[PDB]
Structure 1
Amino acid sequence: GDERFYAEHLMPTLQGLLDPESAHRLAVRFTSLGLLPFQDSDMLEVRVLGHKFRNPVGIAAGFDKHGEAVDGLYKMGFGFVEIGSVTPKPQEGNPRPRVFRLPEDQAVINRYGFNSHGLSVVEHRLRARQQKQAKLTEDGLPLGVNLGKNKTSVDAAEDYAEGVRVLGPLADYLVVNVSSPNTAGLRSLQGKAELRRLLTKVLQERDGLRRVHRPAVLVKIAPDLTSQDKEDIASVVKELGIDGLIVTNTTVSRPAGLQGALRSETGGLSGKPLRDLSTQTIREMYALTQGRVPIIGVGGVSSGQDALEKIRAGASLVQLYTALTFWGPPVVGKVKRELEALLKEQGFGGVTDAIGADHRR
């Protein structure tokens, strides 16, 4: 598992032979079969959300939408895996092409539109390995399940409620994905009144599950929120005792300077141009919640430095996806090795010490 070989040869060859969606599909297949190319220091261990995480580097939602490659992802070195988004009924998502690479920007634009095998299919897939997962979780390798809603659903809150009922018993944490830019009306669920009503329902459903089957609940937010939007979210999160936030989803913005020919495709932008917009959103959300609400930081993480910036901004854990599509599997060990070195260099005893450190200087 050599970084240079993957970065300069394997990935560019793969990217030259297949369209992005096909490459994604082959990636999932290959990962699930456990054919793949770092020993985690105690310094990387984090305890949050009612769990031990052996390292703070997770695979973000969208790579394994249907829960097919969970074990292969742990083998890749991820400290935690998040699957989804999963919708109640199966649905196909948007017409193809719907994923686009911007290699000059180390970015991706996607408009998948919640292509999902649906709750029932994912439920059975997770049930087939439920005890294996119980042991992985106990070993410090938790599982997150990200919930979406169907395109034609009338009642968004009932879609999330159904997700809580069906996959909640199989998850260490649930994500109420209220931030996809690719489902009409979805991001409006981030508004105060809508959000309070939605999350009240979600939390009631979650609280009705048996103790050993009772997941933490997080809300995943956009990087495109107004100051007022962020204030309102922070307020609702604290009012309801939401367990954490995932910050951030993809951006509908197109930062000045994008070079990719495909920069004006519709969809969510991910990877390097998102990085600091995401970090700044983490920083604001951490301040508005007084450091009391765990944050999973996501967006543009490709290095130890990227990870530590999000951690010092207030993230307890980080995730990546887009970097894997450029650098391949060696990126996971790279991020971890670099993060470990930076923690030592900056005088932190471990990840935990660094969480929110920028707010204390």
Structure 2
Amino acid sequence: ESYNPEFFLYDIFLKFCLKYIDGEICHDLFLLLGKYNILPYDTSNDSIYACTNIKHLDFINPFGVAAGFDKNGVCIDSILKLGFSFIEIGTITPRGQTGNAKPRIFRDVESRSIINSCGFNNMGCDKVTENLILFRKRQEEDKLLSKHIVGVSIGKNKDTVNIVDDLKYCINKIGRYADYIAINVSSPNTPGLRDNQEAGKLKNIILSVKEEIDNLEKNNIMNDEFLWFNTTKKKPLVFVKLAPDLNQEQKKEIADVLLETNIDGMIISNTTTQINDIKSFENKKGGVSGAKLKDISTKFICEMYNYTNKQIPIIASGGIFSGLDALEKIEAGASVCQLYSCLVFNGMKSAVQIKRELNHLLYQRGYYNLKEAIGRKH
């Protein structure tokens, strides 16, 4: 009973938390339950007809946890065991950062929306790398986790002048333990970060990251210890996470760069600064997540799927709460889905519930498997 993510008490506690308890306190308590391995867990074998892949990344189901949920990689095992196929830890920076001043996170239950001005609070690449190493050693001994995927989102310290120096630092420390690297050029809460989405700068960033990963492989290929201590046993793939607050010319220029640099995937999208209809967020700063971002980010998937001529796989992030939401992202062009706000508002049952809803929908719509639906809207 207690172990079951749908155990009736979780929804009762969650409704109480969302009404009376500060958002960051709720999150810290979630993390503490995860640290002491007392979160519920999903005991289901996932349907093989809902598996999916990006390149050699073989996802056991299409639902992962988005970056920012476990910034320091302290809760990996327990979050995955809720029923998710992967998690993106981070965003990490070379040096630790406490972030912007609190309160900096606010929820609106009515609209299932969040606004945050966190500012890349994390313990720093060195410490997070130790946390990921601990997970990778537990995984090596637990066959229950051997196929789960862990990506690492990397960014810059607030005061760093050249973003690439920070990106290279992170690759050389944590890259060997990552199944993929996500380049974060889209947070709205680090001044100047989003300027790096300009095509010229983005191109140099992508080529520099790819070159640093390639040098990691070259210089350690005949080491006694195998270099890739991750799930794939291969060098990490490289993804870029994009902001939805771009004009059509910027989107097109970005897509051209993604085609020329052979990026492995794009994460569409980060939070938006263009929603101001949420009364309770008036005179609050930061990016908005959740239901009000669904349509914006789904339209953005369709745009980039077409601008890249379907050659760049897509990871969907933005207002996914239901199996219908997930199928809309997939038919729009996405190969896999990331959740954040769904976890906040639906709680422990999030993965069990959305996986069941998507499966039934694949049945109803007549698909043989999930891959058949990718980009079918087009």
Asked if TM exceeds 0.5, the reply is yes
Structure 1 residues 72-107: Cα deviation after superposition (integer angstroms, max 9, x where no partner):
011110011110000100111101001011122110
Counterpart residue number, 2:266: 245
For 2:93, give the aligned amino acid.
Answer: T
Deviation at 1:308, TM superposition (A): 0.6
> For the Cα contact (< 8 Å) 1:137–1:143, is it kept in 2?
no
TM-score normalised by length of structure 2: 0.90
Q: Does 1:2 align with 2:9?
A: no
Match of 1:120 in 2: 126
Structure 1 counterpart of 2:210:
203
Stretches of structure 2 lacking an aligned partner (at least 5 in a row): 222-226, 229-234
**Pairwise mapping of residues 261-276 of structure 1 onto structure 2 (< 5 A)?**
261-276=280-295
Please name the residue that 2:56 is paired with: 50
Counterpart for residue 223 of structure 1: 244
Alignment of 1:333 with 2:339, yes or no, is no
Distance (whole Å) between structure 2 residues aligned to residue 232 and residue 3 of structure 1: 48
Q: CA RMSD in A?
A: 1.7
- 2:15 and 2:321 mapped to 1: Cα distance? 17
Where do 5+ consecutive residues of structure 1 fail to align?
none
Q: CA separation in 1, counterparts of 2:143 and 2:34?
A: 17
Match of 2:332 in 1: 313
3-state SS of paired residue (1:357): coil
Q: Does 1:189 align with 2:196?
A: yes
- 1:4 deviates by 6.5
Deviation at 1:128, TM superposition (A): 2.0
Offset at residue 192 of structure 1 (A):
0.7
CA contact (8 A) 2:18 2:109 kept: no
How far apart are residue 140 of structure 1 and its match?
A: 2.9
CA shift, 1:68, in A, is 0.4
Counterparts of 1:135-146 in structure 2, within 5 Å, are 139-146=146-153
Give the SS at the match of 1:358. coil
Match of 2:38 among 17, 35, 39: 35
| Shift in alpha-carbon separation, 1:30–1:107, aligned structure 2, 3 A | same
Who is 1:344 aligned against?
363
Offset from partner CA, 1:290-309 (integer Å, 9 cap, x none)? 11111100110111011110
Secondary structure of 1:318 counterpart:
strand
Q: Describe the superposition over 1:37-57 as per-residue Cα deviations: whole angstroms up to 9, x where unpaired.
A: 343111111122312110010
Letter in 2 for 1:161: K
In the alignment, what sits opposite 2:71?
A: 65
1:18 to 17, 21, 29: 21
Q: How does 1:47-196 map to 2 (within 5 A)?
A: 47-133=53-139, 139-196=146-203
Given the superposition, is the C-alpha separation of residues 263 and 106 from structure 1 closer, same or farther in structure 2, using an over 3 Å criterion?
Answer: farther
Offset, 1:205? 0.4
> Counterparts of 2:47 and 2:135 in 1: how far apart (Å)?
27
Corresponding residue SS for 2:121: coil
Q: Which of 294, 298, 301 lines up with 2:320 in the alignment?
A: 301
Separation in 1 of the partners of 2:143 and 2:186?
29
CA–CA separation in structure 2 for the residues paired with 1:3 and 1:35: 13
TM-score normalized with structure 1 length:
0.94
8 Å CA contact 2:333–2:376 kept in 1: the answer is yes
Distance across 2 between alignment mates of 1:191 and 1:4: 48
Distance, in Å, in 1 between the alignment partners of 2:8 and 2:331 is 29
Aligned partner letter, 1:358:
K
Distance 1:66 1:138, change over 3 A: closer
Does structure 2 retain, via aligned residues, the 8 Å contact 1:45–1:53? Answer: yes
One-letter identity of the residue aligned with 1:2: E
1:358 is matched with 377
Deviations 1:156-192 (A, max 9, x none): 1111111111111110000000000000000000001
Letter in 2 for 1:146: S
Letter in 1 for 2:130: H
Greater Cα shift, 236-245 or 31-40 = 31-40
Q: Quick one: which amino acid aligns to residue 218 of structure 1?
A: F
- Equivalent pairs counted in the alignment come to 356
The change in CA–CA distance for 1:312 and 1:3 in structure 2 (over 3 A counts) is farther
In the aligned structure 2, how far is the partner of 1:277 from the partner of 1:51?
27
- Superposed CA offset, 1:116-165 (max 9, x none): 10010011111123244457698431111000110011111111111111
C-alpha contact (below 8 Å) 1:28/1:63 kept by paired residues: no
| Conservation of the 8 A alpha-carbon contact between 1:175 and 1:220 | yes
Q: Which amino acid aligns with 2:6?
A: D
- Runs (4+) of structure 1 moved beyond 6 Å? 135-138
Separation of aligned partners in 2, 1:170 and 1:224: 32
C-alpha distance in 1, partners of 2:7/2:249? Answer: 42
